[PDB]
Design a protein around this motif. Structure first.
Motif, PDB file in Angstrom:
ATOM      1  N   UNK A   1       1.168  -1.205   0.054  1.00  0.00           N
ATOM      2  CA  UNK A   1       0.331   0.332  -0.494  1.00  0.00           C
ATOM      3  C   UNK A   1       0.908   1.199  -0.028  1.00  0.00           C
ATOM      4  N   UNK A   2       1.889   1.415   0.742  1.00  0.00           N
ATOM      5  CA  UNK A   2       2.611   2.424   1.113  1.00  0.00           C
ATOM      6  C   UNK A   2       3.142   2.736  -0.209  1.00  0.00           C
ATOM      7  N   UNK A   3       3.922   3.679  -0.186  1.00  0.00           N
ATOM      8  CA  UNK A   3       4.859   4.044  -1.335  1.00  0.00           C
ATOM      9  C   UNK A   3       6.551   3.285  -1.489  1.00  0.00           C
ATOM     10  N   UNK A   4       6.550   2.256  -0.325  1.00  0.00           N
ATOM     11  CA  UNK A   4       7.975   1.807  -0.652  1.00  0.00           C
ATOM     12  C   UNK A   4       7.736   0.489  -1.323  1.00  0.00           C
ATOM     13  N   UNK A   5       8.334  -0.309  -2.084  1.00  0.00           N
ATOM     14  CA  UNK A   5       8.546  -1.375  -2.369  1.00  0.00           C
ATOM     15  C   UNK A   5       8.675  -3.076  -2.188  1.00  0.00           C
ATOM     16  N   UNK A   6       8.327  -3.857  -1.426  1.00  0.00           N
ATOM     17  CA  UNK A   6       8.545  -5.409  -0.918  1.00  0.00           C
ATOM     18  C   UNK A   6       8.802  -5.976  -2.240  1.00  0.00           C
ATOM     19  N   UNK A   7      10.249  -5.677  -1.938  1.00  0.00           N
ATOM     20  CA  UNK A   7      11.494  -6.026  -2.182  1.00  0.00           C
ATOM     21  C   UNK A   7      11.577  -7.827  -2.006  1.00  0.00           C
ATOM     22  N   UNK A   8      12.156  -9.020  -2.814  1.00  0.00           N
ATOM     23  CA  UNK A   8      12.285  -9.841  -2.396  1.00  0.00           C
ATOM     24  C   UNK A   8      12.881 -11.080  -3.286  1.00  0.00           C
ATOM     25  N   UNK A   9      13.230 -11.820  -2.818  1.00  0.00           N
ATOM     26  CA  UNK A   9      14.859 -12.442  -3.179  1.00  0.00           C
ATOM     27  C   UNK A   9      13.729 -13.883  -4.022  1.00  0.00           C
ATOM     28  N   UNK A  10      13.053 -12.941  -4.745  1.00  0.00           N
ATOM     29  CA  UNK A  10      12.616 -13.935  -6.068  1.00  0.00           C
ATOM     30  C   UNK A  10      12.404 -12.554  -7.202  1.00  0.00           C
ATOM     31  N   UNK A  11      11.884 -11.195  -7.119  1.00  0.00           N
ATOM     32  CA  UNK A  11      11.805  -9.692  -8.090  1.00  0.00           C
ATOM     33  C   UNK A  11      13.026  -9.025  -7.596  1.00  0.00           C
ATOM     34  N   UNK A  12      13.427  -9.138  -6.535  1.00  0.00           N
ATOM     35  CA  UNK A  12      15.097  -8.247  -6.380  1.00  0.00           C
ATOM     36  C   UNK A  12      15.623  -7.948  -7.506  1.00  0.00           C
ATOM     37  N   UNK A  13      15.786  -8.791  -8.233  1.00  0.00           N
ATOM     38  CA  UNK A  13      16.496  -8.749  -9.025  1.00  0.00           C
ATOM     39  C   UNK A  13      15.514  -8.266 -10.834  1.00  0.00           C
ATOM     40  N   UNK A  14      14.493  -8.194 -11.010  1.00  0.00           N
ATOM     41  CA  UNK A  14      13.495  -7.772 -11.687  1.00  0.00           C
ATOM     42  C   UNK A  14      13.376  -6.601 -11.726  1.00  0.00           C
ATOM     43  N   UNK A  15      13.594  -6.092 -10.286  1.00  0.00           N
ATOM     44  CA  UNK A  15      12.976  -4.480 -10.009  1.00  0.00           C
ATOM     45  C   UNK A  15      14.023  -3.825 -10.070  1.00  0.00           C
ATOM     46  N   UNK A  16      14.891  -4.500  -9.015  1.00  0.00           N
ATOM     47  CA  UNK A  16      16.286  -3.789  -8.816  1.00  0.00           C
ATOM     48  C   UNK A  16      17.776  -3.960 -10.312  1.00  0.00           C
ATOM     49  N   UNK A  17      18.064  -4.770 -10.832  1.00  0.00           N
ATOM     50  CA  UNK A  17      18.713  -5.844 -10.556  1.00  0.00           C
ATOM     51  C   UNK A  17      18.402  -5.459 -12.403  1.00  0.00           C
ATOM     52  N   UNK A  18      17.005  -5.423 -12.537  1.00  0.00           N
ATOM     53  CA  UNK A  18      16.856  -5.376 -13.761  1.00  0.00           C
ATOM     54  C   UNK A  18      16.280  -3.834 -14.039  1.00  0.00           C
ATOM     55  N   UNK A  19      16.299  -2.527 -12.918  1.00  0.00           N
ATOM     56  CA  UNK A  19      16.483  -1.506 -13.474  1.00  0.00           C
ATOM     57  C   UNK A  19      17.456  -0.570 -13.635  1.00  0.00           C
ATOM     58  N   UNK A  20      17.960   0.216 -14.681  1.00  0.00           N
ATOM     59  CA  UNK A  20      18.731   0.713 -15.117  1.00  0.00           C
ATOM     60  C   UNK A  20      19.015   1.700 -14.167  1.00  0.00           C
ATOM     61  N   UNK A  21      17.428   2.338 -13.914  1.00  0.00           N
ATOM     62  CA  UNK A  21      17.166   3.589 -12.826  1.00  0.00           C
ATOM     63  C   UNK A  21      18.113   3.319 -11.513  1.00  0.00           C
ATOM     64  N   UNK A  22      18.323   4.367 -10.022  1.00  0.00           N
ATOM     65  CA  UNK A  22      18.627   4.105  -9.386  1.00  0.00           C
ATOM     66  C   UNK A  22      17.766   3.282  -7.938  1.00  0.00           C
ATOM     67  N   UNK A  23      18.237   2.560  -7.513  1.00  0.00           N
ATOM     68  CA  UNK A  23      17.325   1.763  -6.321  1.00  0.00           C
ATOM     69  C   UNK A  23      17.953   2.079  -4.970  1.00  0.00           C
ATOM     70  N   UNK A  24      16.806   1.981  -4.386  1.00  0.00           N
ATOM     71  CA  UNK A  24      17.456   1.773  -2.979  1.00  0.00           C
ATOM     72  C   UNK A  24      17.134   0.774  -1.372  1.00  0.00           C
ATOM     73  N   UNK A  25      17.699  -0.015  -1.118  1.00  0.00           N
ATOM     74  CA  UNK A  25      16.955  -1.213  -0.911  1.00  0.00           C
ATOM     75  C   UNK A  25      17.770  -1.381   0.871  1.00  0.00           C
ATOM     76  N   UNK A  26      16.711  -1.553   1.893  1.00  0.00           N
ATOM     77  CA  UNK A  26      16.809  -1.334   3.043  1.00  0.00           C
ATOM     78  C   UNK A  26      16.294  -2.535   3.578  1.00  0.00           C
ATOM     79  N   UNK A  27      17.822  -3.043   4.642  1.00  0.00           N
ATOM     80  CA  UNK A  27      17.249  -3.982   4.965  1.00  0.00           C
ATOM     81  C   UNK A  27      17.401  -3.833   6.396  1.00  0.00           C
ATOM     82  N   UNK A  28      16.179  -4.321   6.857  1.00  0.00           N
ATOM     83  CA  UNK A  28      15.266  -4.230   8.777  1.00  0.00           C
ATOM     84  C   UNK A  28      15.213  -5.184   8.927  1.00  0.00           C
ATOM     85  N   UNK A  29      14.619  -5.098  10.189  1.00  0.00           N
ATOM     86  CA  UNK A  29      14.528  -6.452  10.904  1.00  0.00           C
ATOM     87  C   UNK A  29      12.643  -6.315  11.537  1.00  0.00           C
ATOM     88  N   UNK A  30      11.742  -7.204  11.462  1.00  0.00           N
ATOM     89  CA  UNK A  30      10.719  -6.738  12.121  1.00  0.00           C
ATOM     90  C   UNK A  30      10.141  -7.196  13.294  1.00  0.00           C
TER      91      UNK A  30
END
Length: 130
Positions: free
Chosen positions: A16-45
């Motif tokens: 819902x939020x603006x943050x894109x839920x990155x996963x080890x299944x799309x991380x590539x098709x989301x970031x790796x496959x993004x010529x643009x800039x990507x900001x991934x933050x590793x947090x812990x629930x």
């Protein structure tokens, strides 16, 4: 069955939020496959300082929504993604641009505001307009 589907998993953030839920299944098709800039933050629930970075990180995702793709990977869950990079102590922000295979250690401010300025500064460096 006939048709498959998915369910809601654990995560301080939400699609819902603006943050894109990155996963080890799309991380590539989301970031790796993004010529643009990507900001991934590793947090812990399960951590504290991390759960307090939900609003700060999200904010940056709202402004950099179209500027810098600000995602979010649950180091706890996606222990594969975090470690695969070298995440041992969260929160741990990573910048993706020059080398999508090797991000940069984000040292800038971890505030919705700072992040915005950080994502931009990096964007410029890249030719990808927008």
């Amino acid at each position: 069955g006939s048709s498959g589907s998915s369910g809601a998993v654990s995560g301080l953030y939400s699609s819902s939020d603006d943050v894109i839920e990155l996963t080890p299944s799309n991380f590539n098709r989301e970031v790796i496959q993004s010529d643009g800039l990507w900001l991934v933050e590793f947090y812990a629930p399960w951590c504290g300082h991390c759960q307090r970075l939900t609003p700060e990180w999200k904010k940056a995702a709202t402004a950099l929504k179209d500027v810098v793709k600000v995602g979010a990977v649950n180091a706890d869950k996606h222990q594969s993604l975090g470690g695969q990079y070298g995440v041992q102590g969260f929160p741990t922000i990573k910048i993706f641009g020059a080398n999508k295979n090797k991000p940069e250690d984000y040292q800038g401010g971890r505030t919705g505001e700072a992040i915005v300025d950080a994502a931009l500064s990096a964007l410029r460096s890249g030719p990808s307009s927008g």
